[PDB]
Design a protein around this nucleic acid. Structure first.
Ligand SMILES: [Mg+2]
Ligand SMILES: [Mg+2]
Length: 140
RNA sequence: UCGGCCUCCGAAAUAUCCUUUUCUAGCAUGUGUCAUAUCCUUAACUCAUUGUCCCUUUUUUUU
């Protein structure tokens, strides 16, 4: 099953909801209300984390970022997890940003449930340790 | 300084007429063809549907 059909399946999830007239208290997103983590998939490999944060900031303030990278070479696998400060920004981003094109590639944005953080057992990098323990965020 | 109108009945809508009984009312008497419309007709002719199209981008939900 091609990834584009996954992008289309989330969009049809939304259109179908509109046709049936479902209320927001029982929307599909309400199953993911507890979490503030969203999966982004299909990204171009040229994008770095400043790019991801630069664009997905339209809907709120990003708390943490996990663009998963190859262990040996360090290059990007293409998918990362973002945590928003508001949980409602996840609704806005899954609706609005699913299936948009960046450098000619469509991306899928979906809610992630019970996201489990990476263990700091590895001492491979330092900046990743800073990102895990502290993470990106405005400083007064 | 005063200032106080009206009130309802029927008809024009469910006909009319004929026949036999029933009820009652009222009386009166007695030394062939090309190329175009149209008309008619035929077939117990039908009155929408939801039945993986998932196929596609170097793209792949993280110890
Ligand atoms: Mg008349
Ligand atoms: Mg008259």
């Amino acid at each position: 099953m091609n990834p584009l059909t996954k992008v289309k399946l989330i969009n049809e999830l939304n259109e179908r909801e509109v046709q049936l007239g479902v209320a927001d208290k029982v929307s599909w997103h309400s199953e993911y209300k507890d979490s503030a983590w969203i999966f982004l998939g299909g990204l171009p490999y040229e994008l770095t984390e400043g790019d991801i944060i630069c664009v997905f900031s339209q809907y709120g303030e990003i708390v943490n970022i996990n663009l998963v990278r190859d262990k040996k070479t360090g290059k990007s696998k293409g998918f990362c997890f973002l945590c928003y400060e508001d949980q409602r920004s996840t609704i806005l981003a899954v609706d609005n940003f699913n299936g948009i094109k960046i450098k000619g590639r469509t991306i899928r944005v979906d809610h992630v449930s019970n996201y489990r953080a990476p263990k700091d057992s590895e001492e491979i990098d330092d900046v990743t340790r800073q990102l895990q323990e502290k993470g990106c965020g405005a400083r007064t």
